[model samples]
Target: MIPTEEALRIVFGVSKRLPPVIVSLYEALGKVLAEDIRAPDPLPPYPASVKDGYAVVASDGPGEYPVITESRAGNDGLGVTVTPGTVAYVTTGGPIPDGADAVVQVEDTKVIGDVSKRVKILIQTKKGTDIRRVGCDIEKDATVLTTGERIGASEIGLLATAGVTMVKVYPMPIVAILSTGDELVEPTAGTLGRGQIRDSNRAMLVAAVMQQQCKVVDLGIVRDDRKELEKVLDEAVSSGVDIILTSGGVSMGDRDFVKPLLEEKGKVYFSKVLMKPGKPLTFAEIRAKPGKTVLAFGLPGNPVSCLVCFNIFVVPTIRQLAGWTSPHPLRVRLRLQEPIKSDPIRPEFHRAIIKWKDNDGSGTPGFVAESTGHQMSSRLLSMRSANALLELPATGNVLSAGSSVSAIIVSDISAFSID
Candidate 1:
């Protein structure tokens, strides 16, 4: 048996980062950048108008001017020049003609006559008004995105604006999910036989891995037989998956064979961890194909224990393999809304709901957490609408309401219900 912290260290120490790959900018969303993205050229490349109006010198104000040429987007203003006392029609995003210092919006000007060649300015204008200067959006050779940054919609837009067609990003890990035990059957297997339960762990693990932006190869459910378990493990390793996640057959029960098989096939780092709900968690490493290595995680059979172990051990490994600088889930400090008790031997990660409050007589906002009802390891309903996990110590102390405590934030604040 090992402490939870030491178990985490062993799990992380054995995981290796995946190699970087080049992908198109459109396909780079939710991926980590492997190299610094620098602006190839200045944005806009030339002075452009930000409104639909006329471009003219600021000195020629409050007077009608003859229209020379119209400048539209995607057109170069080569011969079109807004000389003194002369104006050129310019649309939004259109390039500013030479000799033009300012642009007046169409709302600030009016047509004088039916000639359709002259326009009357209504107000005084200054130089550089309603005009986007060259490189105003971004400068040349500037590092817009640094290494280890996650790419999203906004990052894609910035990369497109910088004329980047391809971007270097860390490849996502391939995860293989398997479920053990003969008592577990697929949900679509119709009526349940005697002492049989539906296999929800596979579905849950598949969704969890997908939510983290990784690919999942479902290995289906395997019985408690040693030959069947060994065959599935060998197949998963031969499939070239980066990680193998198995649920069930990891505890001290008579039918548990996952830990023993792992020790025979590879190196078992730790078979037991000192923590509530997931104390029997097992982590191991298997050498696959020459120099390649595959990580194996044996999660407990209970639904809640399976998910808790995934969040603590598997998720961080996935993040590290994806090349994220901060691979662990975010944590924050919150006040307990109600008193809670835990065992004196093992630490507890109680599920809870976190919300904001404007207390303490100051304008600053604080957070409060409430338990999500019965926190038994077998009761999966305890995770309903839960956005945080309260970190309770193992000192046998009852945490009182309004006492400060640490919490692991699992979701965005907006996703959490206030009530």
Candidate 2:
């Protein structure tokens, strides 16, 4: 038996890192930045108008000015310079005239003469306003994106504005998932008789792998045969996979083949981790290529145990290996509706359903939680009904009701606004 934190440390310590490669901007989403990305040019190349109005020199008359030429977005506003006491028509995002230092919005002014003579109107006055200066948003050669930043939609926009068409990012690792159990059957094949169960572990694994945005190749079910296990593992390594995940067939029972099979290739880190419903967990590193080492994860057979271990440990490790920035689960605290009993030796990850609503309108969303079931990892009924996993502290006893037990909120409920 071992402490959960110690097991996590060991799991993370052995995780290998991946290499970086140049990828197109379109394909860089969810990838970690390997090199510092800087803007090649100013975000706004030139002084641009922020309003649909006249571009006037700062020294021009406060009230009115004569129109020189019209400028609109997507057209050249060049060769038209605004002189003092004169204005040139400009539209939003249009280039400001050379001598123009500010723009007065069209709503703030009216025409003084007919359209033929080119005259303008007046309302209020302000100096050097409504002009989006060059480099205002982003300066040239600025560190637009630093290494280790995760690429998202806004990050994509930032990269585009920086004149960066390609970025050096860490390559996403390829992970293979294998489900092993004689009692399991494909869900599409219909009802499982007696001791038989559907392959719930595979579905949950798919979710975890997808969260990292990495490639997941399903290896189907592994029979209780050591030769078959070795064959699939060989296939996984030769297929250029970065990590291998298998659920079940890792416990102390005589039928467990993962331990001996993994030992045949590389040293096992720990055959078991001291965590509740997950004590059967196994972790190992195998040399697939001369320099490349791939991770092998042996998870417990229980659906909830597999889900919890993957969420708490394996997912982050996979993300790290793929060079994902901030590969940490979001930690938060919530109130428990009922008390919980913890194992004296193992840490328990109780599945839970959390509810949040605006109680008094103070603006922060208040959360209240109730356990999915009696903290049993085999309770699939409760797991299906759970919205999130309530990660309780490592205590060796029962927790009282209304207590602030830490939990990770997983449901995509967007009922409250941060504002």
Candidate 3:
């Protein structure tokens, strides 16, 4: 049995980098930046107002004055200059007048007469009180987005602000999802009557791929037929997919055909991994005209095991193939609320919840750590209702409440790197 860290290292060494593509800002979210982004110009592009007020020289003392010109956003200032006891009407984000050093809000002034154009100073003005200087937010020619950054909402805004509409990122991998089993049925076609169960691993895996900004080809569910499976896999490869994912058929079942076909193609990686719930994993490199490699993760037919395997192995593989430099999930430290039994040899990832109390005695959020009764591979209720994965590393078998236990948050877990 290989240690988790050691296994991950081996995988990383053998994995190849993802290729790059040019995409628009809207489609770049969650994609890794392929190159460094230097600012084409200053963020604001001009010296502008930070507020709606009167533009005046900061050297001048606070006083009443006649407005020489009006400055509003979009329209340039009328080349006006304010000296001592002189000012001009300015709006928010408006460019500073030629000689104005600061702006005083209009609310601080009082008009002399109801119909008069003049105004009175009600409060003293401070020098440089409300002004947004040029290059204050971002400097021209500065590096904006660094290489290997995962694009998010704010990252898009940053790119747009830097005058970058289209950016080069690691191309998202396109995957063809395949589910193999005779007992599996489509969920939408209605629930199963007896031994028949709805296919869920395909949906979960496809969702995972989407979460990584990758495209999916849902081949739907197919029974344990080698000819049909081979046909679908060949079609997927021919359709230009970078990877083909299959669940249920990689196991030691009598109807299993994945290993044999992969062997026939001479494209299989390691036969299996030394891990619980997911010992039957297989990674293979398919040799095609353009050359393609599909990571065939043979997960336990059980639902939770399949999900966990994807989180730990396949997800990282996908991100790496997508050209993401930082393809690790974040680890969080959480105190266990109770004792839980775990296997010492193999690391177990159990479904768990996170509870926290309000700072001001409002209320504490907490939940029970009851095992989903039976952690059978086919069970789905545990994960569907879970908040986090209680990762029991190779430390011990018993972890009590208040024990500092680390977890990988399932929601957006791919974005974090756990220690």
Best by TM-score: 1
Name model 2 segments beyond 4 Å from true.
115-117, 191-195, 289-291, 357-365, 385-387, 393-397, 409-419
What residue pairs clash in candidate 2, if any at all? Answer: 110-121
lDDT of 1: 0.88
Lowest summed lDDT across 10 adjacent residues in model 3 is found at 359-368
**What's the lDDT for candidate 3?**
0.72
Give RMSD to native, each candidate: 2.0, 2.9, 4.0
Give candidate 1 misplaced runs (Cα > 4 Å): 358-364, 412-414
lDDT, model 3, position 23 = 94
Looking at model 1, which ten-residue stretch has the lowest summed lDDT? 356-365
Question: For candidate 3, what is the total of clashing residue pairs?
Answer: 9
Using all chains and alpha carbons, the TM-scores for the candidates as numbered come to: 0.94, 0.91, 0.87
Cα lDDT tens digits for candidate 2, 121-195: 464456768988989988888898888888999999998887788889988888899998778788677756998
| Candidate 2's TM-score | 0.91
Q: Model 1: per-residue lDDT, tens digit, 1-419?
A: 78878998898889888999999987799999999989989887889899999998998888988888788877656777678999888999899999999999999998777735888989999999999999898888889998899998899998988888899999889999999988999979898999999999999899889888898999999999988999999999889899999999998788899999999889999988888878889899999866678899999999998998898899999989999888878888888888898779998889998888777213457888889989999988987778888888888888888788888887666576653
Measured with C-alpha atoms, the lDDT of residue 194 in candidate 3 is 81
In order of TM-score, best first, we have: 1, 2, 3
Q: What are the per-residue Cα lDDT tens digits for candidate 3 across 1-419?
A: 45556656666666777668899988888888999999888866777878777787766655667777778866556656666667777788888787777787778766565652566655666777788788888898998789889888888989988878889988777778888899888878675678888788888888878876678899898778889877777776677777777787877788998778777654665656666556676666675556655555555567777787777777777878877777776567666656777776777777775544332122343322334445555677777646567777755568775566667666643432232
